[PDB]
C-alpha cells in the first residue's frame, strides 16, 4: 500500500489500537476508583466498629 | 496471510481480553459500592 495511515489495513490496525487504548484507560480508571472507595470503606468501618 | 493480518488478529484477541477484564472490573466496582452503601446505612442506624 502507498496510502500510508489511511490504507485499509492500517486504519483497521489504528482503530483496534485506539479502542484497546480506551479500554486500558477505562481499566486504570476503574482501579483508581476501586482503591479510592476501598479507602473510604475502611474509614467508615472504623467509625462503625467505634459506634457499634 | 501477511504480518499485517497477524497484527490485526493479535489486536482483536487483545481487544476481546480487555473487554472481559473491564466487565470484571465494572462488576467488582458495583459489588463494592453496594457494600459501601449498605455499610453507610448501618452507620446511620448505629449513630
Amino acid at each position: 500500500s502507498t496510502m500510508a495511515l489511511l490504507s485499509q489495513e492500517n486504519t483497521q490496525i489504528r482503530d483496534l489500537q485506539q479502542e484497546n487504548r480506551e479500554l486500558w484507560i477505562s481499566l486504570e480508571e476503574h482501579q483508581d476508583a476501586l482503591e479510592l472507595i476501598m479507602s473510604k470503606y475502611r474509614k467508615q468501618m472504623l467509625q462503625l466498629m467505634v459506634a457499634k | 496471510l501477511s504480518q499485517e493480518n497477524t497484527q490485526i488478529r493479535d489486536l482483536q484477541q487483545e481487544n476481546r481480553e480487555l473487554w472481559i477484564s473491564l466487565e470484571e472490573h465494572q462488576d467488582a466496582l458495583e459489588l463494592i459500592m453496594s457494600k459501601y452503601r449498605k455499610q453507610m446505612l448501618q452507620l446511620m442506624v448505629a449513630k
Binding site: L27, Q31, L34, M38, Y41 | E17, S21, E24, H25, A28, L31, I32, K35, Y36, Q39
Partner: peptide, 19 residues
Amino acid sequence: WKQGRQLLRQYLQEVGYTD
C-alpha cells in the same frame, strides 16, 4: 497479564463477599 483478578478478589473479600 490478567493477574488483576487477585486484587479484585482481595477487595471483594475485604468487604465481605465469599467464594
